[PDB]
Amino acid sequence: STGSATTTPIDSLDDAYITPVQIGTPAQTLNLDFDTGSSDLWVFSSETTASEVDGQTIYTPSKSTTAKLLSGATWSISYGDGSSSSGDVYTDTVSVGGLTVTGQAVESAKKVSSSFTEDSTIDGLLGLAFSTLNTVSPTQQKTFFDNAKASLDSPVFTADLGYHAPGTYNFGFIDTTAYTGSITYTAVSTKQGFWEWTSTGYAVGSGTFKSTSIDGIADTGTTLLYLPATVVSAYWAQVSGAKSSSSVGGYVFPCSATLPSFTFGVGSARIVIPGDYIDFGPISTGSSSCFGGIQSSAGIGINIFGDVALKAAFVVFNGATTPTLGFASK
Numbered sequence: 001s002t003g004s005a006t007t008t009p010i011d012s013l014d015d016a017y018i019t020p021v022q023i024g025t026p027a028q029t030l031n032l033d034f035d036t037g038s039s040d041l042w043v044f045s046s047e048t049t050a051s052e053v054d055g056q057t058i059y060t061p062s063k064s065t066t067a068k069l070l071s072g073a074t075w076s077i078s079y080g081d082g083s084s085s086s087g088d089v090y091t092d093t094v095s096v097g098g099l100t101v102t103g104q105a106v107e108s109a110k111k112v113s114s115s116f117t118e119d120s121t122i123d124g125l126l127g128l129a130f131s132t133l134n135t136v137s138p139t140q141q142k143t144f145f146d147n148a149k150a151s152l153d154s155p156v157f158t159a160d161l162g163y164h165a166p167g168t169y170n171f172g173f174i175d176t177t178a179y180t181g182s183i184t185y186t187a188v189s190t191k192q193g194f195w196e197w198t199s200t201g202y203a204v205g206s207g208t209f210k211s212t213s214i215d216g217i218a219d220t221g222t223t224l225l226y227l228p229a230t231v232v233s234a235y236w237a238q239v240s241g242a243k244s245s246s247s248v249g250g251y252v253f254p255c256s257a258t259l260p261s262f263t264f265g266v267g268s269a270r271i272v273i274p275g276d277y278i279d280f281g282p283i284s285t286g287s288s289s290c291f292g293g294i295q296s297s298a299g300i301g302i303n304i305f306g307d308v309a310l311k312a313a314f315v316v317f318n319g320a321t322t323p324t325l326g327f328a329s330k
Helices: 114-118 144-151 229-236
Strands: 003-009 017-023 028-035 041-043 068-078 084-096 099-112 124-127 156-160 167-171 184-187 196-204 210-218 225-227 243-245 250-254 262-266 269-273 279-282 289-292 294-296 303-305 314-318 324-328
Touching: 003 084, 028 041, 041 084, 068 099, 099 144, 184 196, 196 229, 210 225, 229 250, 229 294, 250 294
Parallel strands: 028 124, 041 099, 210 303, 225 294
Antiparallel strands: 003 017, 003 167, 017 028, 017 084, 041 124, 068 084, 084 099, 156 167, 156 314, 184 324, 196 210, 196 262, 225 303, 243 250, 250 289, 262 269, 279 289, 314 324
């Protein structure tokens, strides 16, 4: 089997991407944030505290003839940005772009943090990291991908995120029309439960490439590119007037600037992030200070190849017995 679904930016900045997901019988379609940095499929639901729901579409398990309470199971998750959610668990039929999994754990939120409430466009998350990170207790549950894997034509999914435009998540096949040149594959460590890999270096604008190993995670659920402070300083030093602002929470730059590109290495290959991808706009409405899309990972404890990086590439998440990651230009 295969699946193919369009993923759409939630706003004009590509702060996140939502993908329609069919849950239950008859189908209830929710727009979920596909997140290769976590491993829970959780939704706003009829069980979510009413004051914490503000415009989201909810899953109502009592209206699904295929829903079953997973008795005794609970979940609770906290994300790198300080947001969180928790609740109980149902199993139900879940379909993405024509690919159907029966018996998928659908984690129903009883509580969500304010960041989730305030984002009316995201109805929940669909985790695509390794199932070892799934938070369901006392019986850990598998991700949608893990459940689908054996049925897929090939045990892969691909992320093709758009810049200020829709893109695609495919399951079970590689669309050879969706990228240019060849795909370069690189080793993955699953030891921390992430799609963790090592970039071979970087360049700023038309500058020379610096060969240096940068361990980090491919994370579709993180907006920005978080890299070591040395790398980030070298980038922003090429933008007149750019500075790190402790009050704003990262590098800012004059909105009048033209940003240089940023290149990262994948083996001997190179992925170029255009300068425009690195512009996240005014820090507040009407400001002439703009927020940068490359930020320091210092104090995160890990480097994160988030959407800023991934949307410059066609990315293969290869879930074969020994997982790997592939990157192509597009």
